[PDB]
């Protein structure tokens, strides 16, 4: 019950086939639910037929018959199509702005994250859509990785050496420092703390975080989160004001900060000065010298 992603209007409808379950206003929801592979809409109650044993869950076909929502094959005479005027039935039916060019959101919704072009559109759009694309991307990332081969090592080769078994029907993901797993210790009922470790060439050698001694029965996965919605943009709006706002002028500095003084002022005189850095130019020294310039 909040603003929709493309219109900033209070609605109550959510794409059922999306991953984020985003808010979409009535005409805006009509657009997205006819123009992509999102076929479901949920409101304060889910718009699904109530006749026992129905599993057709499109958007246009459903019919509202009072305290229920039907399909045309499920429909007593007193009704009205839930889809008319190009506008789905839901709260705040009037005061929704909608949007005609929503093919950008449509593509983001259908973006399955395979091509580079997916990332290109995901990085070319506007702000809250940036957020939606980002969180859909990370959610699809964890759908990707967790469902792959189980790290079920079923014996120990030697000191820091192991023998590997993995999931059947689903392949196994890389074993590199770019791919960090997480351990769970099986007992007669459930799992216990082990931690994150890495696998490499062995016959499996593990570059463990810390010392561990695991016998058989153990197996690993690379755990993840359940990423929730965000709040804020990628950056703050800029500034071109007259003051070093909120801080204190300087008395002391070391002359090795000579190249540091000239850029201290620009970062604090306006909202943000985005730093590019060649390798080993003194950036962290600069990032430490920030507090050196103003102890306060």
């Amino acid at each position: 019950v909040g603003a929709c992603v493309l219109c900033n209007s209070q609605t109550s409808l959510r794409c059922g086939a999306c991953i984020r379950r985003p808010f979409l206003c009535c005409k805006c929801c009509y657009d997205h639910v006819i123009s992509t592979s999102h076929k479901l809409v949920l409101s304060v109650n889910p718009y699904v037929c109530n006749a026992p044993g129905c599993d057709v869950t499109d958007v246009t076909q459903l019919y509202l018959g009072g305290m229920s929502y039907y399909c045309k094959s499920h429909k007593p005479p007193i009704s009205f199509p839930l889809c008319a005027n190009g506008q789905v039935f839901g709260l705040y039916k009037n005061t929704c702005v909608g949007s005609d060019n929503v093919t950008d959101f449509n593509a983001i919704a259908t973006c399955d994250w395979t091509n580079a072009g997916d990332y290109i559109l995901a990085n070319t759009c506007t702000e809250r859509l940036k957020l939606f694309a980002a969180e859909t991307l990370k959610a699809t990332e964890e759908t990707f990785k967790l469902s792959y081969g189980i790290a079920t090592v079923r014996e120990v080769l030697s000191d820091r050496e192991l023998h590997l078994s993995w999931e059947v029907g689903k392949p196994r993901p890389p074993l590199n420092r770019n791919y960090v797993f997480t351990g769970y210790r099986v007992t007669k009922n459930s799992k216990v703390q082990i931690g994150e470790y890495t696998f490499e060439k062995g016959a499996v050698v593990y570059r463990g975080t810390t010392t561990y001694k695991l016998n058989v029965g153990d197996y690993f996965v690379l755990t993840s989160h359940t990423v929730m919605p965000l709040s804020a943009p990628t950056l703050v709006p800029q500034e071109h004001y007259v003051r070093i706002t909120g801080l204190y002028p300087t008395l002391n500095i070391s002359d090795e900060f000579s190249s540091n003084v000239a850029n201290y002022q620009k970062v604090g005189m306006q909202k943000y000065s985005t730093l590019q850095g060649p390798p080993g130019t003194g950036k962290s020294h600069f990032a430490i010298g920030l507090a050196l310039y103003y102890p306060s």
Partner: protein, 187 residues
């Protein structure tokens, strides 16, 4: 309700009846263009009476789910209230006196009536009259429930501070007289 498909039809039926009324030729003029009008009767009855029921039912539904959204928000509000209260009273509780008595119990269970009696840090006494004051908490330290207590503050029924010198047998009739004594556990 004017943009319906049958407003134009009843309009043209009555318009032709008007044309023939300006004409006024035959008996079939009357019969027909009272029956061009008498056909456009069901239009403007059902199309303007079934359109008068769907809208009422739609309004019913919209009001109902407004109600349900509000009832769903108040639930989350009260959930947060209860959680904050529980976790707040949790942090006056987890001392070592509590664990000390709990681990001395053979099966983990203890009576609830002996937890404030053995682990509380502060005591409150309510005194009806001076004779009871002399026998319970006279002095500046007294013993109750197998421990030693040390007085800080005395107030009266108006929540005003009394000093221990005022409480006497001949000043007693000048005090609002339930007095409330507060003491701290001595170590």
């Amino acid at each position: 309700f004017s943009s319906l498909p049958s407003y134009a039809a009843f309009a043209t039926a009555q318009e032709a009846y008007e044309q023939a009324v300006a004409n006024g030729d035959s008996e079939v003029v009357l019969k027909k263009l009272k029956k061009s009008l008498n056909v456009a009767k069901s239009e403007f009855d059902r199309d303007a009476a079934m359109q008068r029921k769907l809208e009422k039912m739609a309004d019913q539904a919209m009001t109902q789910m407004y109600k349900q959204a509000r009832s769903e928000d108040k639930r989350a509000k009260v959930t947060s209230a209860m959680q904050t209260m529980l976790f707040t009273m949790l942090r006056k509780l987890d001392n070592d006196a509590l664990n000390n008595i709990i681990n001395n119990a053979r099966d983990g269970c203890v009576p609830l009536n002996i937890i404030p009696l053995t682990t509380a840090a502060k005591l409150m006494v309510v005194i009806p009259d001076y004779n009871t004051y002399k026998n319970t908490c006279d002095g500046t330290t007294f013993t109750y429930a197998s421990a030693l207590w040390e007085i800080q503050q005395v107030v009266d029924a108006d929540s005003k501070i009394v000093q221990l010198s005022e409480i006497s047998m001949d000043n007693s009739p000048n005090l609002a007289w339930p007095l409330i004594v507060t003491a701290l556990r001595a170590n």
